[PDB]
Amino acid sequence: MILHALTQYYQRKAESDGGIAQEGFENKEIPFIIVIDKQGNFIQLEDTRELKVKKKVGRTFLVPKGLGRSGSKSYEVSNLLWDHYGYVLAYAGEKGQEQADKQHASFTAKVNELKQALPDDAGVTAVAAFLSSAEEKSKVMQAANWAECAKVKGCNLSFRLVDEAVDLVCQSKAVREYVSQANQTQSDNAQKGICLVTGKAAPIARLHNAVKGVNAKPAPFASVNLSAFESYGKEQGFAFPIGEQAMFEYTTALNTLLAGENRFRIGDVTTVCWGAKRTPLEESLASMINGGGKDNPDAHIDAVKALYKSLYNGQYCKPDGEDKFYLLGLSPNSARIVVRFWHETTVAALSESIAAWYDDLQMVRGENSPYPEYMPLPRLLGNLVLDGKMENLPSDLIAQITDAALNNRVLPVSLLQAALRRNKAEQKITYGRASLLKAYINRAIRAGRLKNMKELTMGLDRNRQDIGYVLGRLFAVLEKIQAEANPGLNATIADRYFGSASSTPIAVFGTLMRLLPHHLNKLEFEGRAVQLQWEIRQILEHCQRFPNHLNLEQQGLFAIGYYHETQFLFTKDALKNLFNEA
Partner 1 sequence: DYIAHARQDSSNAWHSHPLQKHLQKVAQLAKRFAGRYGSLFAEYAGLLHDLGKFQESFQKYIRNASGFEKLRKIPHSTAGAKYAVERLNPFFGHLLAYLIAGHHAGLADWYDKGSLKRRLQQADDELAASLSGFVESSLPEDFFPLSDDDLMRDFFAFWEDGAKLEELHIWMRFLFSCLVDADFLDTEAFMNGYADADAAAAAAAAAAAAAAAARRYAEQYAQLSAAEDADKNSSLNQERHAILQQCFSAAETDRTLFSLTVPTGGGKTLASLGFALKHALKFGKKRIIYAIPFTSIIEQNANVFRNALGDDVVLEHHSNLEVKEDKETAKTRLATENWDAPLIVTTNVQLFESLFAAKTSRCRKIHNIADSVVILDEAQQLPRDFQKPITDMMRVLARDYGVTFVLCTATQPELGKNIDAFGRTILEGLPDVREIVADKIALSEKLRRVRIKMPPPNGETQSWQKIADEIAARPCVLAVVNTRKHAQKLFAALPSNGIKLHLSANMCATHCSEVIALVRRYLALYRAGSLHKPLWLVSTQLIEAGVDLDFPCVYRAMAGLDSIAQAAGRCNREGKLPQLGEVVVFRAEEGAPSGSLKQGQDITEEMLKAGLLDDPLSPLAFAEYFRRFNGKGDVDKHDITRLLTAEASNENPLAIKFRTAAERFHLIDNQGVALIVPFIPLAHWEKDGSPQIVEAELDDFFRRHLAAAAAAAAWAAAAAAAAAAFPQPPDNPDNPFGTDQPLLAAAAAAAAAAAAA
Partner 2 sequence: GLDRNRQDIGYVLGRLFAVLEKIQAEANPGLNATIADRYFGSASSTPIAVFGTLMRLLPHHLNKLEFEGRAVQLQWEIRQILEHCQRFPNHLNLEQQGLFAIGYYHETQFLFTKDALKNLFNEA
Partner 3 sequence: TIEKRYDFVFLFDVQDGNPNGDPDAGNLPRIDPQTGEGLVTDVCLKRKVRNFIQMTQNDEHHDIFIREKGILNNLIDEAHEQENVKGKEKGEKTEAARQYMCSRYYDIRTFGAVMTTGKNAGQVRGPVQLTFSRSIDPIMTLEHSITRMAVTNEKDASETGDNRTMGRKFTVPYGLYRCHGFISTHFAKQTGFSENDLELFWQALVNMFDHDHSAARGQMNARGLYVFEHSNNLGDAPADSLFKRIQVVKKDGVEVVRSFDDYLVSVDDKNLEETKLLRKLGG
Footprint on residues 128-167 left by DNA (CB under 7 A): 152-154, 156
Does 507 bind partner 3 (CB under 8 A)? Our answer is yes
Sole binder of DNA in the list 56, 139, 234, 294 (CB under 7 A): 56
Residue 378 in contact with DNA, rule: CB under 7 A = yes
CB of 505 to partner 3, least distance (A): 8
Between CA 320 and CA 3 the distance in angstroms is 27
x/- binding map, residues 422-461, to DNA, per CB under 7 A? ----------------------------------------
Which letter, b or e, does each residue of 256-266 get, where b requires 16 or more Cβ atoms within 10 Å of its Cβ?
Answer: bbbbbebbbeb
Minimal distance, residue 533 CB to partner 2, in Å:
8
- Enumerate residues 168-187 that contact partner 1 by CB under 8 A: 171, 176
Per CB under 7 A, the list member of 40, 64, 66, 243 interacting with DNA is 66
Cis peptide leading into residue 354 (ω within 30°): no
Burial 193-203 (b: 16+ CB within 10 A, else e): eebbbbeeebb
Which of partner 3, partner 2, partner 1, none is residue 302 near (CB under 5 to 8 Å by kind)?
partner 1
User: 35 pairs with which residues across the strands?
Assistant: 44, 160
Number of residues lying near DNA (CB under 7 A): 47
Please, are residues 110 and 82 in contact by the beta-carbon 8 Å criterion?
Answer: no
Number of residues near partner 1 (by CB under 8 A): 66
Query: 37 touches which of partner 2, DNA, partner 1, none (CB within 5 to 8 A by kind)?
Result: partner 1
Question: Pick from 166, 514, 524, 573: which binds partner 2 (CB under 8 A)?
Answer: 514
Q: Which of 5, 36, 57, 456 binds DNA (CB under 7 A)?
A: 57
The stretch among 5-13, 138-146, 151-159, 502-510 that binds partner 3 (CB under 8 A) is 502-510
Omega before residue 194 within 30° of 0, cis: yes
454-463 burial, b for 16+ CB within 10 Å, e for fewer? eebbeebbbe
Q: Does 370 contact partner 1 by CB under 8 A?
A: no
Identify what 174 binds: partner 2, partner 1, DNA, none; CB under 5 to 8 Å per kind.
Answer: none
Interface mask (CB under 8 A) for partner 3, residues 417-436, using x and -? -------x------------
Instruction: Kindly state whether residue 281 participates in binding partner 1, applying the rule CB under 8 A.
Output: yes
* Closest C-alpha to 106, from 84, 75, 85, 127: 75
E strand intervals along 173-233: none
Pick what 44 binds: partner 2, partner 3, partner 1, none; C-beta below 5 to 8 Å, kind-dependent.
partner 1
At closest approach, how far in Å is the CB of 550 from partner 3? 10
Q: Which residues pair with 327 in a beta bridge?
A: 273, 343
Number of neighbours of residue 16 by Cβ within 10 angstroms? 16
The listed partner (partner 3, partner 2, DNA, none) that binds 564, CB under 5 to 8 Å by sort, is none
CB 470 within 8 A of CB 562: no
Asked if residues 427 and 567 have their Cβ atoms less than 8 Å apart, the reply is no
Q: Which is nearer to partner 1, 45 or 477 (CB)?
A: 45
Residue from 248, 242, 251 nearest 211 by CA: 251
Residue 87: closest CA among 16, 139, 9, 159 = 159
What's the alpha-carbon Rg for the chain, to the nearest Å?
Answer: 33
Q: Residues 537 to 556: which contact partner 2 by CB under 8 A? A: 537-538, 540-546, 548
Gap between the Cα atoms of 238 and 207, Å rounded? 9
Alpha-carbon gap, residue 89 to 138, rounded angstroms: 7
Out of partner 1, partner 2, DNA, none, what residue 213 binds, judged by CB under 5 to 8 A for its kind, is DNA
Nearer to DNA, 20 or 467 (CB): 20
C-alpha distances in Å from residue 351, one per residue of 133, 318, 321, 343, 408: 60, 7, 10, 12, 10
Whether the Cβ atoms of residue 396 and residue 412 lie closer than 8 Å to each other:
yes
Closest CA to 427 of 353, 502, 373: 502
Report the DSSP beta bridge partners of residue 271. 264
Closer residue to partner 2 (CB): 97 or 463: 463
578 binds, among DNA, partner 2, partner 1, none (CB under 5 to 8 A by kind): none
Are 147 and 71 contacting, i.e. CB atoms less than 8 angstroms apart?
no
Q: DSSP letters of 488-514?
A: S-SS-HHHHHHHHHTT-HHHHHHHHHH
137 binds partner 1 (CB under 8 A): no
Given candidates 18, 293, 366, 372, which one binds DNA under the rule CB under 7 A? 372
**One-letter amino acid for residue 48 of the chain:** T
φ/ψ bin of 447: left (φ > 0), alpha (ψ from -120 to 50), beta (otherwise)? alpha
Binding residue count for partner 3, defined by CB under 8 A = 20
- Report if residue 366 touches DNA, rule: CB under 7 A: no
513 binds partner 2 (CB under 8 A): yes
- Kindly state whether residue 536 participates in binding partner 2, applying the rule CB under 8 A: yes
For residue 468, how many other CB atoms are within 10 A of its CB? 27
Rounded to a whole number of angstroms, the distance between the first and last alpha carbons of the chain is 62
Which residues make up the interface to DNA (CB under 7 A)?
29, 52, 54, 56-57, 66, 69-74, 84, 86, 94-95, 99, 103, 152-154, 156, 210, 212-213, 215-218, 227, 263, 265, 270, 309, 312-315, 332, 335, 370, 372, 376, 378-379, 382, 389
Which residues make up the interface to partner 1 (CB under 8 A)?
17-19, 22, 35, 37, 43-51, 55, 59, 62, 139, 142-145, 162-163, 165-167, 171, 176, 261, 275, 278-279, 281-282, 284-285, 287-294, 296, 299-300, 302-303, 305-306, 309, 313, 315-323, 367-368
Which residues make up the interface to partner 3 (CB under 8 A)?
424, 486, 488, 493, 496-501, 503-504, 506-508, 511, 514-515, 548-549
